[PDB]
Each structure stands twice: as C-alpha cells, then as structure tokens.
Amino acid sequence: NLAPLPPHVPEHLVFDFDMYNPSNLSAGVQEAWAVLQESNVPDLVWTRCNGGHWIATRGQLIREAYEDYRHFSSECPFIPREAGEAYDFIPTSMDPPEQRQFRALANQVVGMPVVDKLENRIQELACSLIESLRPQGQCNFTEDYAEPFPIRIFMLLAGLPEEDIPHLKYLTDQMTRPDGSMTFAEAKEALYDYLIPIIEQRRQKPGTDAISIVANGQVNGRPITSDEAKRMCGLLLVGGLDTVVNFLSFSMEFLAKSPEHRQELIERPERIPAACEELLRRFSLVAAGRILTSDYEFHGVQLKKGDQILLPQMLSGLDERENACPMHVDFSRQKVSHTTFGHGSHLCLGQHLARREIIVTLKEWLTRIPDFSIAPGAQIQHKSGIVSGVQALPLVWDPATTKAV
Numbered sequence: 001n002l003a004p005l006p007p008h009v010p011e012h013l014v015f016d017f018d019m020y021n022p023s024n025l026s027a028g029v030q031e032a033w034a035v036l037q038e039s040n041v042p043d044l045v046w047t048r049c050n051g052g053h054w055i056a057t058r059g060q061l062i063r064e065a066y067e068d069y070r071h072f073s074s075e076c077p078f079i080p081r082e083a084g085e086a087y088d089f090i091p092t093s094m095d096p097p098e099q100r101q102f103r104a105l106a107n108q109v110v111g112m113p114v115v116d117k118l119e120n121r122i123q124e125l126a127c128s129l130i131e132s133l134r135p136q137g138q139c140n141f142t143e144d145y146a147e148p149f150p151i152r153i154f155m156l157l158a159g160l161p162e163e164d165i166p167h168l169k170y171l172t173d174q175m176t177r178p179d180g181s182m183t184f185a186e187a188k189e190a191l192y193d194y195l196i197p198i199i200e201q202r203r204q205k206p207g208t209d210a211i212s213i214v215a216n217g218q219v220n221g222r223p224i225t226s227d228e229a230k231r232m233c234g235l236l237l238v239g240g241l242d243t244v245v246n247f248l249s250f251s252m253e254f255l256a257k258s259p260e261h262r263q264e265l266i267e268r269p270e271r272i273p274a275a276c277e278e279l280l281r282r283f284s285l286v287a288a289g290r291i292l293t294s295d296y297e298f299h300g301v302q303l304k305k306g307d308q309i310l311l312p313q314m315l316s317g318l319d320e321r322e323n324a325c326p327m328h329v330d331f332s333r334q335k336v337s338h339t340t341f342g343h344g345s346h347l348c349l350g351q352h353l354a355r356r357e358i359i360v361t362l363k364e365w366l367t368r369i370p371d372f373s374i375a376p377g378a379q380i381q382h383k384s385g386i387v388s389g390v391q392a393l394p395l396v397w398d399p400a401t402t403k404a405v
C-alpha cells in the first residue's frame, strides 16, 4: 500500500494522499483534493501512495513546474510510474523542442477552424438529446447526455462507428480511473490494437476525418510516421471520450443543486460563456504531472532525478491564493484564475471544442429544462484519478415546467 520512504524525503513532508481514492471523497472530489490546501499542509508534500511521489499543492508551484520543462519533463507524466512509463502519446509525452511540431497537426483536427463548422452538428445533437429526455421528467445524466453528446461528436469527427463506443470508452477509462482489470500498458496496447489497422486503411485511402488527416499529415514539412500517427490518435481518443464527458456531470450536478445559478443564466444568457469559465475553475478535474530530469531544489525541497511530481491542474484555481472564496461559484468573478486546460507548452488543444460543447449544453438544457433537481434520496458519488468524474447523476423534473422548442 504505502511505498517505503526514499532516503532523501523527510518525514515532516509526508502526507499520504491517494489520488485514486482520496480519503475525503464523499465530500465531493474537488473538496477531497482541497484537503491538500489546508493551512497546516506545506506547498510541496510527499505521498507514499501509488508508488510514492511529490505533490505540488498550490497554484504558484503548479504553474512554475509546468513552465519549467527542463527540470520537469513530460516523458513520464502520469502516476503510478508504470503508467507514466507506458504513456507515449503525442504530443503529451514529449518536451520542447520536439513536442512543438506536433501541435500544429493536432490543431488541424481539433482546433478552432474544426470547431467553427462542427458548430451546426454540435448544436443539433445537443437539442435532439435534450428534447428526447425533456418529456420523461427524469434521466441518468451520465449515460443519457454527458457520455453520448461529446462522444458522438468525437466519433463523427474521427469517422469511427458509434457501435465502437462501449469498447473504446472502457479502454480510455482504464487509463484514467483503472478498475484494476488492466494495467495502463494493457489498456494502451488495446487502444493501439484498435487504431493500427484503421490508420493503415486511411493512409492507403485517405478520407476527411481526423484520423485520415493525422495519418496523412506533415510535421514541420516532413511526413508523419505510422507510429507517430497512432500515438497522436490515441491521445485524441482519450480527450474525446474522457474529458468533457466528466466535466458536464460536475456542472449539471451543481446546477441541479443551485436554482439561483440556473435562474441567473436563464435571465441573463449573455453570462453563459463567463459561467462556463467559472465552472471550469470550480469543477476542474485533471491531475497529471512530470518527472524530474535532474536533482533540483525547488521551494526549499530536495527533489532527485527520477522522482515523480503530481502537478494537479485541478488545484490551481481552487487555491485561495489564486481566487478568494474558491469553493464559491460566482459567475461575475472578475479574474477567474485556473489551469484547468493545463499550463505551459502543453496547453490543451481541445479547449475550444470543450468550451463549445459546454456552452451549447448550458444554453440548450436551460432553454428546455429550466427547473430540475437531484433525484429523491440520491447521494451523488464522485470518482478520482487522472481525470475525475461523477459515478451517476439521477435528475428529476416536472415536465409541465419544461419547454419544447
């Protein structure tokens, strides 16, 4: 369970936080992680859980370390070590300088130009899914919307059949919130087993889908290899199937529990983009990290080459030193500070797609189902990992209070 303490780590920095099962999980996952920001907890701690690793607990350190790729490398970006070692996606397992040439290609398939004209289809799917639920007066939000909306958009973009979703979603989840049945390496290899033949098919016969574009792409003017294409497409699948999917459920759970915030967005719909940003701060959900490239003293702590450091994207915006009353949701917050989409050279490329999906969801849901609540007697359970989420979100409403557009 707890790994032996390395010789260079002092006892007074030991805080045995378990990122895959944090002790305060029942309070909400963000709340469970925020225990690391109680006043008695140092800026940088060592946990003996999950093989042993550092955790930066404050936005200042998280930001600094994400900027300093020379000391803090993306070569091994996940805890536990076996996962970070097996992780070879592109561009996320690379540091500058080599990383950068791959970002332009990834931008061609998930960047703003692609969003801007997926626009209509995103809007259409949100409206159709929500209208189908509306007269029922209930739904299981995770399965009925949070999954199918972003995942079907991604499968469309990638030119992949919707009947492949259960398999691909299972595999993706083993990389972020493993159930124990597969190691990271096994889940990754299964994803590659799916992708390799499709990549060769689309290098032989190119389409207009994201996989064809990556597979036939150029990287700073030279052809991408089949291997590189596979390593990029693996990442695109995880972003498509396990990011927005979880975030929408945190947001909708909050709106179900806060009628005042629902009413604010109904009355002042122009605030929806700002609300999206504030929700991205409050219900931030990613916790990746880096590996030390050399011995390095950082904020008075001796780190050794090979040490892993968890740098939770989630924590920066929850830090009271970045945002006053950080657990409070304020759509009028003037400077919404967060690192929800990362920081430094690996800033999320999917963020424009994510914001569109969020904003469309908020607008189109509140237009049709302005009044809803958590199902009677339900206690909402979160789950923690590289990406955190919501296990189930049963919602109810009176259909008489809804509106078919």
Ligand code: HEM
Binding pocket: 074, 077, 090, 091, 092, 093, 099, 103, 106, 110, 154, 235, 236, 239, 240, 243, 244, 247, 285, 286, 288, 289, 313, 340, 341, 342, 343, 345, 346, 347, 348, 349, 350, 351, 353, 354
């Ligand atoms: C709420 C939704 C999302 C969040 C919170 C999120 C978060 C992040 C974070 C924290 C990173 C940086 C990881 C690191 O520094 O090691 C990242 C990178 C990336 N994300 Fe997102 N992501 C989201 C949605 C998406 C989607 C929908 C896609 C595409 C379908 C996507 C594609 C990417 C790509 C390609 C990178 C790699 C950038 C690089 O390594 O240079 N993301 N994301």
Ligand SMILES: CC1(C)[C@@H]2CC[C@@]1(C)C(=O)C2
Binding pocket: 089, 092, 176, 235, 238, 239, 243, 286, 288, 386, 387
């Ligand atoms: C940390 C991430 C959210 C980012 C996009 C998908 C993800 C799980 C990665 O492997 C990089």
Ligand SMILES: [K+]
Binding pocket: 075, 076, 077, 084, 085, 086, 087, 088, 093
């Ligand atoms: K690796």
